[PDB]
Amino acid sequence: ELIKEEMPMKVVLEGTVNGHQFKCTGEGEGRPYEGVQTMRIKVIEGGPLPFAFDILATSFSRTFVKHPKGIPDYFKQSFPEGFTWERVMRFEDGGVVTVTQDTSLQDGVLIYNAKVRGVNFPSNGPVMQKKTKGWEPNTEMIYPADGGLRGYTDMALKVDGGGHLHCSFVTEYRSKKTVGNIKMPGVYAIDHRLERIEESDNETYVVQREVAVAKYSN
Amino acid sequence: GEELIKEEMPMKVVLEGTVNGHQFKCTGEGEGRPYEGVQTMRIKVIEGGPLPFAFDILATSFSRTFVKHPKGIPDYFKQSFPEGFTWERVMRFEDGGVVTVTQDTSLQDGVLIYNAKVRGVNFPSNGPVMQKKTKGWEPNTEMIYPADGGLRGYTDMALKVDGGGHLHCSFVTEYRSKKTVGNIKMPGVYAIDHRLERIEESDNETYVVQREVAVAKYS
């Protein structure tokens, strides 16, 4: 109900990848009930990144998922308190990313605060060499748990040449709402497509749009 | 498949890896009762011992063939023979430690052959694991979901710490049959109660004996 038909965001993401420190800010808007959102991102410190921005792209938004009538919306129900998500991204080439994020709501604005630690990226890998060309459309599996959701996607990062780099994404979503009932969903699936709209100054500025739609699985 | 899994089976295991850049190799021999859900492993750290970390984070990577399945729950694991199955796991500790695991289970001349590669990273130097202040895992429940011909396993584990605390760890496991031709009867959602217990250790944990009880039930 505090999640309006049109909602704006402000995001701050910081971390280390291999040893390289950076800080990013974003502002954006979208239609949480239609499942669309756009983000304007700046690398404000440590830019240009000596690695593909694609490994950060997925860490800038699950409030903006179109849920059919019959699938309860864990994300939208989490307000005003919001929810946290924790992710491990396991790259086939040996790279690992750990992500901690806080989603909150302040004065009608969604506030995202993400911390990121990447380690063991092959210095010769496509990521550290910036030879990546975006993520494939994909589907995330959602499994309920004691006061939370578990998220699984086998993701494919496109490489120069037309190869893919395999990466398992696995996420813990947890409401910060501890009192009052959330209606829990069963298992379902979220088709998500993230597309880069625009980049400049060696990827220190990026515009991206995500379209996400929930569906019945089993 | 289920015919090749006898009421007693032995196993042999190689486990190799790196934790926070420290390299090691472990071998194991053991045996168990797959339909009763009991198994025992005698493990040796044969290279890079004593480990500058708690064996407990490796313990859990040394066996789902040995899970007591009631008649009504199809046993994905026993059905996967003689090809056997692979499992892939992420263990995230609340204190930042992360372990990535790849394992190959195969059957050779009536012996189960385990091969595991382990990659630990971001264990805090001052944390209970790197400080070897752990006292084994709590009994816990794994949720099993079917996923496109494989299974996904989710446990929220608790590693006991010196002084009565716990270090909390999420486990995600992708299990995948190497049986590509032939049909496997897929289970629905179910649960596995699993208790891993250290029986015996010596020589600064370069020799460890552990037993696991694992029993499937409806969810």
Q: Which of B118, B91, B120, B86 is nearest to B103 (CA)?
A: B86
Q: How far apart are CA A208 and CA A41, in angstroms?
A: 8
Nearest to A88 among B92, B146, B154 (CB): B92
Q: List all residues 6 or more positions away from B32 whose beta carbon is below 8 Å from its beta carbon.
A: B8, B9, B11, B38, B39, B40, B63, B66, B212
Strands A164-175 and A188-200, sheet pairing: unpaired
Three-state DSSP class for residue A63: coil
**Number of domains chain B contains:** 1
Q: List all residues 6 or more positions away from A91 whose beta carbon is below 8 Å from its beta carbon.
A: A97, A121, A125, A127, A157, A165, A166, A167
Q: Is the peptide bond before A8 cis (omega within 30 degrees of 0)?
A: no
How many residue pairs from chains A and B have C-beta atoms closer than 8 A?
48
Terminal-residue alpha carbon distance, chain B: 25
Q: Which residues of B touch A187 (CB under 8 A)?
A: 145, 189
Gap from B92 CA to chain A (nearest CA, Å):
8
Interchain contact, A96 vs B98, CB within 8 Å: yes
Interchain contact, B172 vs A187, CB within 8 Å: no
DSSP label at residue A94: S
Interface probe, candidates B90, B151, B190, chain A, greatest A C-beta count within 10 A? B90
- Measured CA distances, B65 to A11, B12, B84, B211 (Å): 46, 14, 9, 14
Q: In angstroms, what is the resolution?
A: 2.8
Terminal-residue alpha carbon distance, chain A: 28
Q: How far apart are CA B101 and CA B15, in angstroms?
A: 10
Gap from A180 CA to chain B (nearest CA, Å):
24
**Residue A165 domain boundaries:** 1-218
